[PDB]
Amino acid sequence: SWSWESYLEEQKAITAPVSLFQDSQAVTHNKNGFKLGMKLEGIDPQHPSMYFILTVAEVCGYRLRLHFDGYSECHDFWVNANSPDIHPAGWFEKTGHKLQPPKGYKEEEFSWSQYLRSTRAQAAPKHLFVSQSHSPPPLGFQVGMKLEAVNRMNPSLVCVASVTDVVDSRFLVHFDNWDDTYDYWCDPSSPYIHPVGWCQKQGKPLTPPQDYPDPDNFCWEKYLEETGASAVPTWAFKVRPPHSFLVNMKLEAVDRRNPALIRVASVEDVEDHRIKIHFDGWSHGYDFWIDADHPDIHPAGWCSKTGHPLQPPLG
Template sequence: MRKPVPQKAIEWKDGRQIKHARSGRPSRVPSQYQGGHFSWDKYLKETGASAAPAHCFRQGATPPVNEFKAGMKLEAQDPRNTTSTCIATVVGLTGSRLRLRLDGSDNKNDFWRLVDSSEIQPIGNCEKNAGMLQPPLGFRLNASSWPMFLLKTLNGAEMAPARIFHKQEPPAPEQNSFQVGMKLEAVDRKNPHFICPATVGALRGVEVLVTFDGWRGAFDYYCRYDSRDIFPVGWCSLTGDNLQPPGTKGLCVHVWYVCLFVCFRRSRDI
């Protein structure tokens, strides 16, 4: 099995000295970016924080290998109607995650899943288990046209081979072992293609409040401690995902877009 290829580090050549977004005075790039990429070691040292231990997460010791390709079809649970299994197409991928679109839906309802998620299966799994593939919630055509739509969708399509699916998800931790103040990496649910540095802001039974470092509270959310949307520190460096930088609200917006542009160009060159 091949190993995930890490993304190339962003070079911050245009950001050695920038203007503070509010004061307009020159400001240097935070030291955790110096050297061309975000450094968790420097960031933890500067903030005096500690990383959440790996045993807190429902993630494997090593990230699952992603052998999917854009355009492949598979079966997926409809996230808006979890009792339905639908046909989905891989429309994007990053690291160990897939961006999926339910066939018969539109791009407004795209969602992301880890490649070892139990909510995705090879084509034929539903029928094998005496189930029926269903149209997605909000199917754009008349419901009576679903059987014919399904036939046309699968005819000649590239099916994701069963061998690239993972047999099972990692087991959930026995209990919520997070503590307030611990650092982690988390999916930004308002922009789920991003994974960002975050902090445990509060605990509520089996739930954890994910607060994103340097961003206003509108992006924060509660999730179960065994959510697949939260990861231990260093996850992105292993999968090749670009970990989004914290605290950008204090940086010039122009510099932020420059960084995103460089990141995009680098990802295309890999």
């Protein structure tokens, strides 16, 4: 009943063109084959360096709600079916990663074939993942390399960091000696990562590893000699072009408070790489910043074309 076309006429508004979105945010013709009950492997959004066994708890359009086997439902989270952060059963073994066992297990007694029988569940077929385990690694980024990275919750802190994982075309950025929670997955064009020695050439302060002795005198050359690690090569950094979203353009975005919902949205403000989302009909107190390449923002029509409910403006 509610329609974008009429809303646009009603508001004299324009939608953010599909061309401003990454292909993965815009694609609507892919089928979602995940079914309730299927089991798979995936990273913990709150500990992106760790892999757990997850179960499909809900399917809605091109999205799915995953549940941490043996854990409380509080931990449940939503992803798109084309998410690069989930993998078919057996992935951790083929790629050399470690798999945390269900709450109640120990790795020494985990095996898919048998956890599957014990649960009488089926594993999500591997073609079902837009990805798999073929993708060539990101050029010039290898586990162990070091670089400088922005701490996304401490946007003005550019810290000493390291590449701790590499999956397909992305890598995991870790802040030396800090909590694994601040870690995040990147690709070579991320605007949050810089070549070793960037802060110095910019006159910006650089935050050294936690408890690093005599912090005031942290010296990169000393640090990598100490660690015997290599700096990610300068040529590997291919930072991306600023997005072209303009204020007032409309789109669809997942609700941050109730992730199961997606609402009509507008671009309230912009930066080179981020856009401030405003949910039509709600208080601006809910407005939030989000990277332009975030998987949870989509062009008008995405919910309709994928079979997902769309929450119209608040009234």
